[PDB]
Amino acid sequence: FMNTAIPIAAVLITFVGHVSFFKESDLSPSVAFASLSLFHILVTPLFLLSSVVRSTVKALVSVQKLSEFLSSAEIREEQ
Amino acid sequence: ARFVSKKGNCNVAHKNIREQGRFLQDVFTTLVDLKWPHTLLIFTMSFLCSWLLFAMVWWLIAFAHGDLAPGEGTNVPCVTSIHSFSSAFLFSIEVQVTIGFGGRMVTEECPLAILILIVQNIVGLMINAIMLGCIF
Amino acid sequence: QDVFTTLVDLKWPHTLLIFTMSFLCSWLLFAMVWWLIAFAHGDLAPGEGTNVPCVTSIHSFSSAFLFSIEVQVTIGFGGRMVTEECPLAILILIVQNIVGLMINAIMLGCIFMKTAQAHRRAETLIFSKHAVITLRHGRLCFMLRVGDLRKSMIISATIHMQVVRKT
Amino acid sequence: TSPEGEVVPLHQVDIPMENGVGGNSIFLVAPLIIYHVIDSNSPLYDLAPSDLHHHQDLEIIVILEGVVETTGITTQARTSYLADEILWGQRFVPIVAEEDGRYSVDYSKFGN
Amino acid sequence: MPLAFCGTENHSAAYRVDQGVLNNGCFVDALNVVPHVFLLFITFPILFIGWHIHHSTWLHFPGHNLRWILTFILLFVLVCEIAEGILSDGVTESRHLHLYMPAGMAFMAAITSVVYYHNIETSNFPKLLIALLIYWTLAFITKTIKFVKFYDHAIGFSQLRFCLTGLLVILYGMLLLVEVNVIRVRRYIFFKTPREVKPPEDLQDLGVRFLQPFVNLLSKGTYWWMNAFIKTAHKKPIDLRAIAKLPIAMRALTNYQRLCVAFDAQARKDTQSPQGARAIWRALCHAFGRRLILSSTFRILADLLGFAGPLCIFGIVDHLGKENHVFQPKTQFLGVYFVSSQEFLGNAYVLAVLLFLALLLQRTFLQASYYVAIETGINLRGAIQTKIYNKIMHMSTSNLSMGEMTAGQICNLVAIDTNQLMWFFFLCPNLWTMPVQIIVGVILLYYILGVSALIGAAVIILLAPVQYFVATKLSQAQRTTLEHSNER
Amino acid sequence: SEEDDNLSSVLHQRAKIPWRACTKYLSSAGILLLSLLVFSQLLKHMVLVAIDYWLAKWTDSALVLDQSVYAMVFTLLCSLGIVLCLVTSVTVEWTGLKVAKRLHRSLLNRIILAPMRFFETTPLGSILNRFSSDCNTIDQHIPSTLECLSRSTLLCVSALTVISYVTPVFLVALLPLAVVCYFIQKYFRVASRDLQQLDDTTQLPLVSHFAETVEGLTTIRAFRYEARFQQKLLEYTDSNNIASLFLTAANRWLEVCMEYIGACVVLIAAATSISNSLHRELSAGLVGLGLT
Ligand SMILES: *[C@@H]1O[C@H](CO)[C@@H](O)[C@H](O)[C@H]1NC(C)=O
């Protein structure tokens, strides 16, 4: 739900707080769709990078154990 | 795991072969092997290719001298009564098919036009003889 | 006959150069004789006519070349035409016409012969570099390895092992 | 394989057409049958019906070489019926019939 | 009203040949047409002829990697040139097709030269491309004629056509350089013994199915080679008969050899920390960092192009918002009009065309970056998997009580730890690009809207910790479910 | 024999089991539950496209010039859309949980009364494998993918309807592009399910091979057959690798085709919209919303 609700809530606040806070800059269809399109593309990297960092920590933890495994007692070769 | 096809078309996956280059003579032999629709298609395209290519140079050589501009009696045109690219195309195809129109002929005072005229006849006979041999 | 067949077996660029030069020489040769007919009747000074010509619009040697290039390859422009009052011009026109329709034809025949001969590609057989002598079926025997390269099949192939010795 | 210490993957052995003259040359304009008589000096000497299955490595090729009278071109017909096609203890039905006008031969009787 | 090459303005007065034949305006445009139409009518019969021993060797002439990207940027500017030409001709009275018909034929010349290259690269025959060589010089010659003609009039950088011509000469020049490169590489037409090269081992091998790493750049980019495979598998199932041995470099044995080289290099560098976590990290970096950085650079380029998307649609809606929406023919030189960048970028038709081309390049480069990252991950696995396998063979089975427990651990390790490491390697390009992507994104919102978009971007970024929080909650929930379902 | 097996495999491959999946969902969720779920999904997408259209029409009037009054309807619609997403998300989770709890109870009550001869005739290992792992997937993965697929499919069809609204002639281009994308999807699905099964069936021996060696370290080292095992390990890993490599490559091709088609839509939509708006005086908001 947060993934689906983040972009709609974000764009609604932007269009609302534009005029009501500082109407010194009149809205226009040009800037409106520009900002809308930018949010539509940028919504996915944000909710994806959260999974990327969660994967990096688990990969770092697992690879650290792998190094400890390689440093274990190995069978000595011939001579 | 078969060796020879039962129908007769014995195919063999000849591999581990050295890099064998192909010259232009083998390309010519493959042109002969093309069937009737393929030969007719490439023949029509090649003749149109030659016709339009010679049309382009004739239109270029007409616009080079100034024949494309309205000649006020003085400027002798390299090709008479050539007005637009369509007219140049008609003149070019007439030379390369030995038709002959007379009205839009070619005259003197333009050695470049003479050189283009002679080379087309030589190249036109060559491609005509090649086309005759291919279909024959 | 021998000197004619020699050119048949020439390579592609040689025959192209020979054919192109032959046509150009034939065209140039007719230009010289056509210019001679001009020099007889049609002078460089036009004189406002005053004499019935037999080759119209032939004002210079270049015009005669245009007449030759139009008549020998059967284009036939109308700006320059042949007329009466010149029996030698009629005679040379018949001679020019017959040699024309023959010179291209004999050149056209070479292309037919060339495309038949050039489709041979006979150097497409693979063999070994040395000889092998070993045992087969229990007895010592000579042997060799053969191969083919063409996509097609060597139909009705016959093989002879011709041993040459000084005995 | 060979008793010398090696093996050949595609070793070829040839059995003649068993013609009355013993030459590999036959004249035919109406379909006819060709029989090769297996003998002691033949690969079929030890041929058993057990090997007549489909998963055997024994291919019999019958190359037909003939030149046409029209354009003098040579024709190369190839055939590779393996032991899966041939069946043991079979024979062909009479392929040719007798008629008043001309001799007739049934072409569909080949598969019978 | 006629339909000739150049307009009939002033009763075709521009068709004059005085004051210099080359100095004429209409003449130089026609000169550029000549080499293009020459290539068209010299290649069509040879191409239709071509349309065992050659289909199993997808060889390549040297420099083809640069040639493919060179022709791509060349066709890019050519279609842009057509758009520039039609914009200038619209304001004029006559049709003036001379501004976009020559470049229209040039675009068809570029595409036919590329397919001729591919059709002639399927077999080792470098002698057939002399037509391309004699075409490129003539194209370069006529391109320089246009450049010097514009300099003699001093149009300048105001008109975009001058800049397009000035870059096309360099583009043609680079084509000449990469073309003559194969001469010194091969020496096939100007020397006695050509230095012929043999196909690689993987291509020459009978059983090979994954030939993507060694294929033409177009196929390597858009996976067009897969068409055949994607169709055949529709009828028959997929088994180990279609799939075959992996390529030589893609096999795990070569990857294992590269890993040992990196380990030996890392050991000789800093043996103070042998078999340490950072040591393995640095070894994997110096081993696979080449393709890793390659995938990252492709993703950076893809992200930059993806930003241009909204940056392009801004112009289209702005141009419609303009009330007058009149043409801008003010700038002109020698009678004929010439568009300017400040109005060429605003024209609606070209902006949509440029967006399509830019989006095509984007949607392609994004896929390349992901594929390289995925390809590196499987290769890293095949290398890391056998590295543990070698350790298993060399390990000592001491502490049987402690060794028994580790048997399940090491089996679980090679199952989940290796898989989780590959996911990091798969997402590593995304991790590298995410900061600059988001940074560029918030910056562009400011320039688009202002302080309003700043607060909007903050609310969007506010959803990142929410995802992190629920991810920890989901992990806790998943552990509880797994613990309960295990006993169940 | 082999031909009949291949024909049966091809028939089973093309069988997407549409009615089977539909009947399972309908029997599990409930007549009232499924109705609420589909209504919530439809309502969420309807208000989503509605607020986008309202943004276009509101900003168009501002440029031609009640701006503060119109902004209130946007906030009202934004809250309604947020509420619709919360309802749809909660419904999808609840439906999956109810489906899982009903499916497990039915399966448990059915297996508990199985005949004694069935237990001896059927392998208990395969029964447990087909019971435990399968219900865990249905419980933990079915709701997430179904909600994502429903959201994606409804979003896609709604977007296409917006293109048709802003450009009536777009249907002339939709028909040749819809069939080609369906054709690619077909040839992908028939080849991707097999490649997923093959990748699983090739990655399992990898874990088995690792398990076998780690158990018999002493006996393998005594046999001194290390060289053969190194080749064996490479062979098993190679089969696994190419599986995971074909899969992604095939996946990439599908994505590439999809995105190329998408770009063609953009062109075929924006181009016509230009010649439509400049001529038919179409508002910039419509073309802007359609292009977005
Ligand atoms: C060309 O046309 C322009 C505009 O009518 C005119 O001013 C100019 O004199 C013309 N030039 C010639 C050479 O006709």
Coordinates of N, CA and C in Angstrom, one line a residue, chain E residues 151-313:
Chain E
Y151 N 31.7 27.6 -45.2 CA 32.7 28.5 -44.6 C 33.0 29.7 -45.5
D152 N 32.9 29.5 -46.8 CA 33.1 30.6 -47.8 C 32.0 31.6 -47.7
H153 N 30.9 31.2 -47.1 CA 29.8 32.2 -46.9 C 29.7 32.6 -45.4
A154 N 30.3 31.9 -44.5 CA 30.4 32.3 -43.1 C 29.0 32.3 -42.4
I155 N 28.3 31.2 -42.5 CA 27.0 31.1 -41.8 C 27.2 31.1 -40.3
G156 N 28.1 30.3 -39.8 CA 28.4 30.2 -38.4 C 27.7 29.2 -37.7
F157 N 27.8 29.2 -36.4 CA 27.1 28.2 -35.5 C 25.7 28.6 -35.3
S158 N 25.2 29.7 -35.8 CA 23.8 30.1 -35.7 C 22.8 29.0 -36.3
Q159 N 23.0 28.7 -37.5 CA 22.2 27.6 -38.2 C 22.7 26.3 -37.8
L160 N 21.8 25.4 -37.4 CA 22.2 24.0 -37.0 C 22.7 23.2 -38.1
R161 N 22.3 23.6 -39.4 CA 22.8 22.8 -40.5 C 24.3 22.9 -40.7
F162 N 24.9 24.0 -40.4 CA 26.3 24.1 -40.4 C 27.0 23.2 -39.4
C163 N 26.5 23.1 -38.2 CA 27.0 22.3 -37.2 C 26.8 20.8 -37.6
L164 N 25.7 20.5 -38.1 CA 25.4 19.1 -38.6 C 26.4 18.7 -39.7
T165 N 26.7 19.6 -40.6 CA 27.7 19.3 -41.7 C 29.1 19.2 -41.1
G166 N 29.4 20.0 -40.1 CA 30.7 20.0 -39.5 C 31.0 18.7 -38.8
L167 N 30.0 18.1 -38.2 CA 30.1 16.8 -37.5 C 30.0 15.7 -38.4
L168 N 29.3 15.8 -39.5 CA 29.2 14.7 -40.5 C 30.5 14.4 -41.2
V169 N 31.3 15.5 -41.4 CA 32.6 15.3 -42.0 C 33.5 14.5 -41.1
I170 N 33.4 14.8 -39.8 CA 34.2 14.0 -38.8 C 33.7 12.6 -38.7
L171 N 32.4 12.4 -38.8 CA 31.8 11.1 -38.7 C 32.2 10.3 -40.0
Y172 N 32.2 10.9 -41.1 CA 32.7 10.3 -42.3 C 34.2 10.0 -42.2
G173 N 34.9 11.0 -41.7 CA 36.4 10.8 -41.5 C 36.7 9.6 -40.6
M174 N 35.9 9.5 -39.5 CA 36.1 8.3 -38.6 C 35.8 7.0 -39.4
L175 N 34.8 7.0 -40.3 CA 34.5 5.9 -41.1 C 35.7 5.5 -42.0
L176 N 36.3 6.5 -42.6 CA 37.5 6.3 -43.4 C 38.6 5.7 -42.6
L177 N 38.8 6.2 -41.4 CA 39.9 5.7 -40.5 C 39.6 4.2 -40.1
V178 N 38.4 3.9 -39.7 CA 38.1 2.5 -39.3 C 38.1 1.6 -40.5
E179 N 37.8 2.2 -41.7 CA 37.8 1.3 -42.9 C 39.2 1.0 -43.3
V180 N 40.1 2.0 -43.4 CA 41.5 1.7 -43.7 C 42.2 0.9 -42.6
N181 N 41.7 0.9 -41.4 CA 42.2 0.1 -40.4 C 42.3 -1.4 -40.8
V182 N 41.2 -1.9 -41.4 CA 41.2 -3.3 -41.8 C 42.2 -3.6 -42.9
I183 N 42.7 -2.6 -43.6 CA 43.7 -2.8 -44.6 C 45.0 -3.3 -43.9
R184 N 45.5 -2.5 -43.0 CA 46.7 -2.9 -42.2 C 46.4 -4.1 -41.4
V185 N 45.1 -4.4 -41.0 CA 44.8 -5.5 -40.2 C 44.9 -6.8 -41.1
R186 N 44.4 -6.7 -42.3 CA 44.2 -7.9 -43.1 C 45.1 -8.0 -44.3
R187 N 45.3 -6.8 -45.0 CA 46.1 -6.8 -46.3 C 45.5 -7.7 -47.3
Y188 N 44.3 -7.5 -47.7 CA 43.6 -8.5 -48.6 C 43.5 -8.0 -50.1
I189 N 43.8 -6.7 -50.3 CA 43.6 -6.2 -51.7 C 44.8 -5.5 -52.2
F190 N 45.7 -5.2 -51.3 CA 46.9 -4.4 -51.7 C 48.2 -5.1 -51.3
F191 N 48.1 -6.4 -50.9 CA 49.3 -7.2 -50.6 C 49.2 -8.6 -51.1
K192 N 50.3 -9.4 -51.0 CA 50.3 -10.7 -51.6 C 49.6 -11.7 -50.7
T193 N 50.1 -11.9 -49.5 CA 49.6 -12.9 -48.5 C 48.7 -12.2 -47.5
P194 N 47.3 -12.4 -47.6 CA 46.5 -11.7 -46.6 C 46.6 -12.5 -45.2
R195 N 46.7 -11.7 -44.2 CA 46.8 -12.2 -42.8 C 45.4 -12.7 -42.3
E196 N 45.0 -13.8 -42.9 CA 43.7 -14.4 -42.5 C 43.7 -14.9 -41.1
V197 N 42.5 -14.8 -40.5 CA 42.3 -15.2 -39.1 C 41.3 -16.3 -39.1
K198 N 41.4 -17.2 -38.1 CA 40.5 -18.3 -37.9 C 39.4 -18.0 -36.9
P199 N 38.2 -18.6 -37.0 CA 37.1 -18.4 -36.1 C 37.5 -18.9 -34.7
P200 N 36.9 -18.3 -33.7 CA 37.2 -18.8 -32.3 C 36.8 -20.2 -32.1
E201 N 37.3 -20.8 -31.0 CA 37.0 -22.2 -30.7 C 35.5 -22.4 -30.4
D202 N 34.9 -21.5 -29.7 CA 33.5 -21.7 -29.3 C 32.6 -21.7 -30.6
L203 N 32.9 -20.8 -31.5 CA 32.2 -20.7 -32.8 C 32.5 -21.9 -33.7
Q204 N 33.7 -22.4 -33.7 CA 34.1 -23.5 -34.5 C 33.6 -24.8 -33.9
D205 N 33.3 -24.9 -32.6 CA 32.8 -26.1 -32.0 C 31.4 -26.5 -32.5
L206 N 31.2 -27.8 -32.7 CA 30.0 -28.2 -33.3 C 28.8 -27.9 -32.4
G207 N 28.9 -28.3 -31.2 CA 27.8 -28.1 -30.2 C 27.9 -26.8 -29.4
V208 N 27.2 -25.8 -29.9 CA 27.2 -24.5 -29.2 C 25.9 -23.8 -29.5
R209 N 25.2 -23.3 -28.4 CA 23.9 -22.7 -28.5 C 23.9 -21.2 -28.1
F210 N 24.7 -20.9 -27.1 CA 24.8 -19.5 -26.6 C 25.9 -18.8 -27.3
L211 N 25.6 -18.3 -28.5 CA 26.6 -17.5 -29.3 C 26.4 -16.0 -29.2
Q212 N 25.6 -15.5 -28.2 CA 25.4 -14.1 -28.0 C 26.7 -13.4 -27.7
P213 N 27.6 -13.8 -26.8 CA 28.9 -13.1 -26.6 C 29.7 -12.8 -27.8
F214 N 29.6 -13.7 -28.8 CA 30.3 -13.5 -30.1 C 29.2 -13.5 -31.2
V215 N 28.7 -12.3 -31.4 CA 27.7 -12.0 -32.5 C 27.8 -10.6 -32.9
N216 N 27.1 -10.2 -34.0 CA 27.1 -8.8 -34.4 C 26.5 -7.9 -33.3
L217 N 26.9 -6.6 -33.4 CA 26.5 -5.7 -32.3 C 25.0 -5.5 -32.2
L218 N 24.4 -5.5 -33.4 CA 22.9 -5.3 -33.4 C 22.2 -6.5 -32.6
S219 N 22.6 -7.7 -32.9 CA 22.1 -8.9 -32.2 C 22.5 -8.8 -30.8
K220 N 23.8 -8.5 -30.5 CA 24.3 -8.4 -29.1 C 23.5 -7.4 -28.3
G221 N 23.0 -6.4 -29.0 CA 22.2 -5.4 -28.3 C 20.7 -5.8 -28.0
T222 N 20.1 -6.2 -29.1 CA 18.6 -6.4 -29.0 C 18.2 -7.9 -29.0
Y223 N 19.2 -8.8 -28.8 CA 19.0 -10.2 -28.7 C 18.2 -10.8 -29.9
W224 N 18.4 -10.2 -31.1 CA 17.7 -10.6 -32.3 C 18.0 -12.1 -32.7
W225 N 19.2 -12.5 -32.3 CA 19.6 -13.9 -32.6 C 18.6 -14.9 -31.9
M226 N 18.0 -14.5 -30.8 CA 17.1 -15.4 -30.1 C 15.9 -15.8 -30.8
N227 N 15.5 -15.0 -31.8 CA 14.3 -15.2 -32.6 C 14.2 -16.7 -33.1
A228 N 15.3 -17.2 -33.7 CA 15.3 -18.6 -34.1 C 15.0 -19.5 -33.0
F229 N 15.8 -19.5 -31.9 CA 15.6 -20.3 -30.8 C 14.2 -20.2 -30.2
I230 N 13.7 -18.9 -30.1 CA 12.4 -18.7 -29.5 C 11.3 -19.3 -30.3
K231 N 11.5 -19.5 -31.6 CA 10.5 -20.1 -32.5 C 10.6 -21.7 -32.4
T232 N 11.8 -22.2 -32.5 CA 11.9 -23.7 -32.6 C 11.4 -24.3 -31.3
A233 N 11.7 -23.7 -30.1 CA 11.2 -24.3 -28.9 C 9.7 -24.3 -28.7
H234 N 9.0 -23.6 -29.6 CA 7.5 -23.6 -29.5 C 7.0 -24.9 -29.9
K235 N 7.6 -25.7 -30.8 CA 7.2 -27.0 -31.3 C 7.7 -28.1 -30.4
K236 N 9.1 -28.2 -30.4 CA 9.7 -29.2 -29.6 C 10.1 -28.7 -28.3
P237 N 10.1 -29.5 -27.2 CA 10.6 -29.1 -25.9 C 12.1 -28.8 -25.9
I238 N 12.5 -28.2 -24.8 CA 13.9 -27.8 -24.6 C 14.6 -28.9 -23.7
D239 N 15.7 -29.5 -24.3 CA 16.4 -30.5 -23.6 C 17.9 -30.2 -23.7
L240 N 18.8 -31.1 -23.3 CA 20.2 -30.9 -23.4 C 20.7 -31.2 -24.8
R241 N 19.9 -31.3 -25.8 CA 20.3 -31.5 -27.2 C 20.4 -30.1 -27.9
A242 N 19.4 -29.2 -27.6 CA 19.5 -27.9 -28.1 C 20.6 -27.1 -27.4
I243 N 20.5 -27.0 -26.1 CA 21.5 -26.4 -25.2 C 22.8 -27.3 -25.3
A244 N 23.9 -26.7 -25.2 CA 25.2 -27.4 -25.4 C 26.2 -26.8 -24.5
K245 N 27.5 -27.2 -24.7 CA 28.6 -26.7 -23.9 C 28.7 -25.1 -24.0
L246 N 28.9 -24.5 -22.8 CA 29.0 -23.1 -22.7 C 30.3 -22.6 -23.5
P247 N 30.4 -21.4 -23.9 CA 31.6 -20.9 -24.5 C 32.8 -21.0 -23.7
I248 N 34.0 -20.9 -24.3 CA 35.2 -21.1 -23.6 C 35.4 -20.1 -22.4
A249 N 35.2 -18.8 -22.7 CA 35.3 -17.9 -21.6 C 34.2 -18.0 -20.6
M250 N 33.0 -18.3 -21.1 CA 31.8 -18.4 -20.2 C 31.9 -19.6 -19.3
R251 N 32.7 -20.6 -19.6 CA 32.7 -21.8 -18.8 C 33.3 -21.5 -17.4
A252 N 33.0 -22.3 -16.4 CA 33.4 -22.0 -15.1 C 34.9 -22.3 -14.9
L253 N 35.5 -23.1 -15.7 CA 36.9 -23.4 -15.5 C 37.8 -22.2 -15.8
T254 N 37.5 -21.4 -16.8 CA 38.2 -20.2 -17.1 C 38.0 -19.1 -16.0
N255 N 36.7 -19.1 -15.5 CA 36.4 -18.1 -14.4 C 37.2 -18.5 -13.2
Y256 N 37.3 -19.8 -12.9 CA 38.1 -20.3 -11.8 C 39.5 -19.9 -11.9
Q257 N 40.1 -20.0 -13.1 CA 41.5 -19.6 -13.3 C 41.7 -18.2 -13.1
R258 N 40.7 -17.3 -13.6 CA 40.8 -15.9 -13.3 C 40.8 -15.6 -11.8
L259 N 39.9 -16.3 -11.1 CA 39.8 -16.1 -9.6 C 41.1 -16.4 -8.9
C260 N 41.8 -17.5 -9.3 CA 43.1 -17.8 -8.7 C 44.1 -16.8 -9.0
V261 N 44.1 -16.3 -10.2 CA 45.0 -15.2 -10.6 C 44.8 -14.0 -9.7
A262 N 43.6 -13.6 -9.5 CA 43.3 -12.5 -8.6 C 43.7 -12.7 -7.2
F263 N 43.5 -14.0 -6.7 CA 43.9 -14.3 -5.3 C 45.4 -14.3 -5.2
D264 N 46.1 -14.8 -6.2 CA 47.6 -14.8 -6.2 C 48.1 -13.3 -6.2
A265 N 47.5 -12.5 -7.1 CA 47.8 -11.1 -7.1 C 47.6 -10.4 -5.8
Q266 N 46.4 -10.7 -5.2 CA 46.1 -10.1 -3.9 C 47.0 -10.6 -2.8
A267 N 47.4 -11.8 -2.9 CA 48.3 -12.4 -1.9 C 49.7 -11.7 -2.0
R268 N 50.2 -11.7 -3.2 CA 51.5 -11.0 -3.4 C 51.5 -9.5 -3.0
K269 N 50.3 -8.9 -3.2 CA 50.1 -7.5 -2.8 C 50.2 -7.3 -1.3
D270 N 49.2 -7.8 -0.6 CA 49.1 -7.7 0.9 C 48.9 -9.1 1.5
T271 N 50.0 -9.8 1.7 CA 49.9 -11.1 2.4 C 49.7 -10.9 3.9
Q272 N 49.6 -9.7 4.4 CA 49.4 -9.5 5.9 C 48.0 -10.0 6.3
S273 N 47.0 -10.0 5.5 CA 45.7 -10.5 5.8 C 45.3 -11.6 4.8
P274 N 45.8 -12.8 4.9 CA 45.5 -13.8 4.0 C 44.1 -14.4 4.2
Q275 N 43.4 -14.7 3.1 CA 42.1 -15.2 3.0 C 41.1 -14.4 3.8
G276 N 41.4 -13.1 3.9 CA 40.4 -12.2 4.6 C 39.3 -11.8 3.7
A277 N 38.2 -11.3 4.4 CA 37.0 -10.9 3.6 C 37.4 -9.8 2.6
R278 N 38.1 -8.7 3.1 CA 38.5 -7.7 2.1 C 39.4 -8.2 1.0
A279 N 40.2 -9.2 1.3 CA 41.1 -9.8 0.3 C 40.3 -10.4 -0.8
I280 N 39.3 -11.2 -0.5 CA 38.4 -11.8 -1.5 C 37.7 -10.7 -2.2
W281 N 37.2 -9.6 -1.5 CA 36.5 -8.5 -2.2 C 37.4 -7.9 -3.2
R282 N 38.6 -7.5 -2.8 CA 39.5 -6.9 -3.8 C 39.9 -7.8 -4.9
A283 N 40.0 -9.1 -4.7 CA 40.3 -10.1 -5.7 C 39.1 -10.1 -6.7
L284 N 37.9 -10.2 -6.2 CA 36.7 -10.3 -7.1 C 36.6 -8.9 -7.9
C285 N 36.9 -7.8 -7.2 CA 36.9 -6.5 -7.9 C 37.9 -6.5 -9.1
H286 N 39.1 -6.7 -8.8 CA 40.2 -6.6 -9.8 C 40.0 -7.7 -10.9
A287 N 39.2 -8.7 -10.6 CA 38.9 -9.8 -11.6 C 37.8 -9.4 -12.5
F288 N 36.6 -9.0 -11.9 CA 35.4 -8.7 -12.7 C 35.0 -7.3 -12.8
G289 N 35.9 -6.4 -12.3 CA 35.6 -4.9 -12.3 C 35.4 -4.3 -13.7
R290 N 36.1 -4.9 -14.7 CA 36.0 -4.4 -16.1 C 34.5 -4.5 -16.5
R291 N 33.9 -5.7 -16.6 CA 32.5 -5.8 -17.0 C 31.6 -5.2 -16.0
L292 N 32.0 -5.2 -14.7 CA 31.1 -4.5 -13.7 C 31.0 -3.1 -13.9
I293 N 32.1 -2.4 -14.2 CA 32.1 -1.0 -14.5 C 31.4 -0.7 -15.9
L294 N 31.5 -1.7 -16.8 CA 30.8 -1.6 -18.1 C 29.3 -1.5 -17.9
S295 N 28.8 -2.4 -17.1 CA 27.4 -2.5 -16.8 C 27.0 -1.2 -16.1
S296 N 27.8 -0.7 -15.2 CA 27.5 0.6 -14.5 C 27.4 1.7 -15.4
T297 N 28.4 1.8 -16.4 CA 28.4 2.9 -17.3 C 27.2 2.9 -18.2
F298 N 26.8 1.7 -18.7 CA 25.6 1.6 -19.5 C 24.3 2.1 -18.7
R299 N 24.3 1.7 -17.4 CA 23.1 2.1 -16.6 C 23.1 3.6 -16.4
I300 N 24.3 4.2 -16.2 CA 24.4 5.7 -16.1 C 23.9 6.3 -17.3
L301 N 24.3 5.9 -18.5 CA 23.9 6.4 -19.8 C 22.4 6.2 -20.0
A302 N 21.9 5.0 -19.6 CA 20.5 4.8 -19.7 C 19.7 5.7 -18.8
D303 N 20.1 5.9 -17.6 CA 19.4 6.8 -16.7 C 19.4 8.2 -17.2
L304 N 20.5 8.7 -17.8 CA 20.6 10.1 -18.3 C 19.6 10.2 -19.5
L305 N 19.5 9.2 -20.3 CA 18.6 9.2 -21.4 C 17.1 9.1 -20.9
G306 N 16.9 8.3 -19.9 CA 15.6 8.2 -19.3 C 15.1 9.5 -18.7
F307 N 16.0 10.4 -18.2 CA 15.7 11.7 -17.7 C 15.3 12.6 -18.9
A308 N 15.9 12.5 -20.0 CA 15.6 13.3 -21.2 C 14.2 13.1 -21.6
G309 N 13.6 11.9 -21.4 CA 12.2 11.7 -21.7 C 11.3 12.7 -21.2
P310 N 11.1 12.9 -19.9 CA 10.3 14.0 -19.4 C 10.9 15.4 -19.8
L311 N 12.2 15.5 -19.9 CA 12.7 16.8 -20.4 C 12.3 17.1 -21.8
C312 N 12.0 16.0 -22.6 CA 11.5 16.2 -24.0 C 10.0 16.5 -24.0
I313 N 9.2 15.8 -23.2 CA 7.8 16.1 -23.2 C 7.5 17.5 -22.6

